Design a protein. Structure first.
Lengths: 69, 132, 132, 71, 132, 71, 132, 69
């Protein structure tokens, strides 16, 4: 809920996760997903967990493919 | 690494319903999953067709960030050409977009993942899975 | 660079009729001519559909050897989605494959070359020429 | 593609994650805020809120308004 | 991805007036907004033209921090050339900088967003929206 | 860019020039014709003449002509 | 390596007249020569404005293959912004396109090559050469 | 005036200039320029010689820049 800064390390901008918002020690590797400006840091394997929670498509989202045939 | 091609059907099925069965499945084969550009144009269409394009598209963007999008290549076009021609003789009818998705997979040798295997069963030489 | 996207309509028209007016247009704008991979699969299909596929395909390959084939990319897919959605609301009907070819053109800003102007004239943000 | 795997390293007392060049942030961004959801962490460029700038500092009246485009 | 190219007209209009209608449009289509480098130099010029450049530039920088700046590329230059040539024959007059912004949009197929529709309406193959 | 420098090497009795990956020919091209102008050599993909194909082999009447596009 | 930026003026001067003096000069500094995208849009315009676009453009394509084309970047836009603002106070008038070319050069520190140095002399901090 | 074929050598498509159309031995290095399908093989330094010869721009080529100002 606070803020941090990135830093060029090992030729990568990387990040410094605060101890206040640090990940579980049981998480060795973490998938990083790029969407627009935001970057999603999801545990390895645990990638799709963010997308399924929330981010609800609108109720009028056309389920019909309307494929000609 | 990439082994699975998600058809258009399963994508909307996930995008709309977000089923729990698909949750862990997607998580398991993360990095080994791809979608055809044909599939992309359909999901984009549904979003832009809807009354809240920016929202649905955002959900779509998130989906597309995890999976690799495959551009329709000459191999896919040629393969689909054959696929289409075969189906003519067989009499079996397959959807226009679905035809392209099938050939696209066969060209790159991917496994098709679909909730409705019925349509794809007509086309031969394809591996079809049902993740619903 | 590349300025024109050749529709499926005009390609078959040229492939079959071999029209003189088109040859000039072809020679004049040599090097500025491209086709979508979507365009390729249709002619590939048509060739294999005939009683002499290898004959027909052979002529087809020569055509594609001179033209550059443009892979249907995510940009093409997204633009096609919009075009489809736009045309959906307006009610103007455009063919599935044609929609994809149009989106490919608009994505890279190419000029569509087709004998059927009225159909593509429905699509917005697109430039259409008739070389027939 | 869009997906990209990376490992983690504790430095400066803070556990840290490398950003591969695929997900590399724009170099313009100099500060970043971190949000917490489940085990997933969300990285948003700080101060990217459009509403912030609109109520933020406003520009003087000496702006020409006229584009004075040559013509 | 990116869908809208912000004209110089509307940018200054927003920068000065800070209109509420535009804010919604901005927040709604956040992330889909870009400006040409041509657009950047004008506002940079206007800021430095004022009696408080650093003040004005500071507000300007904040704006550009949220929007992605698109470098004027050869594709933009070529498309602008065509637009200029087209408009030349037709006689419709469009501003120099505006011509360049339009070509940038058409090259990448973006939607132009501007308060002055009539001027950009002269340009063909372009989609224009007015968010004012 | 478009410009690109390369050296030369005699092989197979024939003096030969490498094509850097920038000027690398499309892999589809399998044969090439060489034209002679001053000290500059011109490399054109053989059989790229549009007029050749037009008077070349023509296609059977079993071409559907109808696109049979689904609709 | 790249040290010289060819303004629009000298390019057309060469493209039209093809002067012998420029022949050996161009040959000498091959590989150290570049042009701005602003310059490109102008030469494209002249070609497409002409009654034989395909021909002139072909000549232009050959020219552009030897020289490197530089996309207008934020640095050029910002630099031109300053350049434009300065000229306002000085009262000295410089052409719209020429202003952008000048800033583009200063941003990357290139040497301007022009047949008409008069206009560029107003702008400061630039190195101007006359290859005519 | 005849023909040849390219060959993947040293990770380059390269070319085999026939002895019939071989370059002067005094030419050690040769610039290669890419325009469309065609590739121009011009002696080092002697790059621009092809472009200036022939390839005449049309007589109606607008010399005027028509710059607004």
């Amino acid at each position: 809920h606070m803020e941090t800064t990135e830093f060029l390390s090992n030729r990568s901008q990387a990040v410094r996760l605060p101890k206040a918002v640090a990940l579980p020690e049981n998480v060795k590797r973490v998938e990083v997903i790029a969407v627009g400006r935001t970057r999603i840091i999801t545990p390895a394997g645990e990638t799709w967990d963010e997308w399924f929670d929330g981010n609800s498509v609108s109720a009028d989202f056309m389920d019909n493919r309307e494929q000609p045939g | 690494m990439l082994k699975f091609m998600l058809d258009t059907n399963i994508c909307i099925f996930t995008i709309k319903n977000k089923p729990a069965s698909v949750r862990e499945r997607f998580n398991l084969n993360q990095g080994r999953m791809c979608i055809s550009s044909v599939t992309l144009m359909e999901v984009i269409y549904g979003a832009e067709k809807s009354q809240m394009p920016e929202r649905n598209l955002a959900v779509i963007e998130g989906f597309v960030s995890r999976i690799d999008v495959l551009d329709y290549d000459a191999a896919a076009a040629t393969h689909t050409g054959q696929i289409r021609a075969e189906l003519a003789l067989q009499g079996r009818p397959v959807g226009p977009f679905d035809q392209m998705i099938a050939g696209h997979a066969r060209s790159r040798g991917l496994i098709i993942v679909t909730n409705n295997t019925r349509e794809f069963e007509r086309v031969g030489g394809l591996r079809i899975e049902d993740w619903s």
